[PDB]
Design a binder for this molecule. Structure first.
Ligand SMILES: Nc1ncnc2c1ncn2[C@@H]1O[C@H](CNS(=O)(=O)NC(=O)CCCC[C@@H]2SC[C@@H]3NC(=O)N[C@@H]32)[C@@H](O)[C@H]1F
Length: 264
């Protein structure tokens, strides 16, 4: 109830002013009061012929949010930055598309990391789509294909209470950021995202280096839950050129393209 006072609406006109124009790759930005899923919405635009490259859709509230492989994403009004962007990908070899999602996580982390007074333990990226802080999930990322595009979706907990959405969640507010400004954070996020997408498109080695530098997974003992329910336990060693997680399982290398990681 008290957090409602900490949740003013986004300023669409201001965001457009900052993010659309010379020197920016963003072509269109809309803030909607509510939708089922920003990712579904941009996918639908693309399916009906729209050019969604550089298009940004932000929702104040999202009622049927999607997580990875069939799961959901929970939100309440004005508690998160909930957005999707369109990225033309057909010019880039399909092998490299995995890195687009890792790039997005890096952009989200970099957009908020300074806001914390002192970095609590376990602040960084958990493979393949998670921004963690103090062991809690601060943001989740979802990439979906609609040729010639990928739709990249970000759900970032700004004032969202864990009790409102998930026991393993956290938020900037719950990390001690007393009055987070979503307008400032959204602008920072989209500027970081633009740079990382450009790096991805040009196979810039700094993208992988920067990802490794913020990885909480690399070097850690992990249990990885694979699609289909199997678990593999090992030590995460690296990410390969396809964005896949390279596991050491007692001297054998197991490369995982998709799965859920638990740090042990
Ligand atoms: N708030 C929330 N904060 C933190 N955690 C949470 C939370 N709402 C649930 N869990 C938990 O996360 C689980 C899903 N996690 S996941 O499989 O790794 N998927 C993701 O993290 C990707 C989420 C992408 C969300 C964005 S929001 C804008 C865009 N449009 C969409 O519909 N999706 C993307 C879910 O089953 C629930 F367990």
């Amino acid at each position: 109830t008290d957090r409602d006072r900490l949740r003013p609406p986004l300023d669409e006109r201001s965001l457009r002013d900052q993010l659309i124009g010379a020197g920016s790759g963003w072509r269109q930005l809309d803030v909607v009061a509510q939708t089922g899923s920003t990712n579904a919405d941009l996918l639908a635009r693309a399916a009906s012929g729209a050019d969604i490259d550089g298009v940004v859709l932000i929702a104040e509230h999202q009622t049927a949010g999607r997580g990875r492989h069939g799961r959901g994403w929970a939100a309440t009004a004005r508690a998160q930055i909930i957005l999707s962007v369109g990225v033309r990908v057909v010019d880039v070899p399909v092998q490299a598309w995995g890195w687009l999602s890792l790039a997005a996580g890096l952009a989200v982390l970099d957009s908020v990391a300074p806001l914390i007074a002192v970095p609590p333990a376990e602040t960084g990226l958990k493979w393949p789509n998670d921004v963690l802080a103090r062991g809690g999930k601060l943001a989740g990322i979802l990439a979906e294909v609609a040729q010639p595009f990928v739709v990249l979706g970000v759900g970032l907990n700004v004032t969202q209470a864990p009790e409102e959405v998930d026991p393993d969640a956290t938020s900037l507010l719950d990390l001690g950021v007393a009055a987070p400004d979503r307008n400032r954070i959204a602008s920072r996020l989209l500027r970081e995202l633009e740079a990382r997408i450009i790096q991805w498109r040009n196979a810039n080695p700094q993208l992988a280096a920067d990802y490794r530098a913020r990885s909480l997974t690399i070097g850690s003992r992990v249990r990885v839950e694979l699609p289909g329910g199997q678990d593999v336990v090992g030590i995460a060693r690296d990410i390969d050129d396809q964005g896949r997680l390279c596991l050491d399982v007692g001297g054998r290398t197991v490369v995982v393209s998709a799965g859920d990681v638990v740090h042990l």
